Amino acid sequence: AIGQRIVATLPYIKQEVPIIIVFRALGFVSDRDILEHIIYDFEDPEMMEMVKPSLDEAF
Amino acid sequence: KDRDSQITAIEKTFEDAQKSISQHYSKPRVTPVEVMPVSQAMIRGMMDEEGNQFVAYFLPVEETLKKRKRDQEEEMDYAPDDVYDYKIAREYNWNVKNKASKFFIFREGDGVYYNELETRVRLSKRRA
């Protein structure tokens, strides 16, 4: 809608799933933990704003 | 199987190695020239640091700082892990503490005699 959303087409599932939902389903609920796993350099706001829509879509 | 055949077969090589040889194994076309008859402890060296345990590597006939490599133990809990260094004096030379780096068999021309002196444990030393 507002920005570019990241989705994940898992096997045996016929609907796209947000990546943040998959991360939480694996036990990583805090957004900090998920971006620790995704973004390894926190000095880089470009990656951050490009992942932000996915977080905003899964709250 | 049996020992009366093992005794004679082990002596058999000790006897056959001393006969006349004039031919190769695959193609007997190459004539022989000469023969080289056959505990121990070798200090390995790192190829970058380039270690001079002896005076040979230092390009020396004899020790210009010693006369006898008195290979003495590093401690009481290290028989194979001694401390080899070329220092006849209590001087603070290159203290090469040969750590325990635990077949590499060695032999020599012992006056054209039949023996062996295979190595016990490959040690390697550094500059301590």
Partner: protein, 117 residues
Amino acid sequence: PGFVGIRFCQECNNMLYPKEDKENRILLYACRNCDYQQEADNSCIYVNKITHEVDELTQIIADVSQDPTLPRTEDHPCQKCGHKEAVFFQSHSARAEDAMRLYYVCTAPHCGHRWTE
């Protein structure tokens, strides 16, 4: 202007979203999971660089000087260490049209200075 980074709550470690306090007429960053709030210090909430004026020297890493497949030159010495040799390469990055520009890196170990002519 510069970009704006994401900031997380101090309790739930979720991202802080922007909010406005009418009472003081001031920007706040508040968590929509917990009830944490924070006084902003930048006052800027969003930044879009449409021109994409990115300094690609920041994207380069000195380790690239170890690449045997990159070209080396002796004509551009390093301004930081004085080493003569240096690897050079083009941008090869999308969203960069004028990408024939060359970026240089010093091959001296532990210097790793990077620059552009």
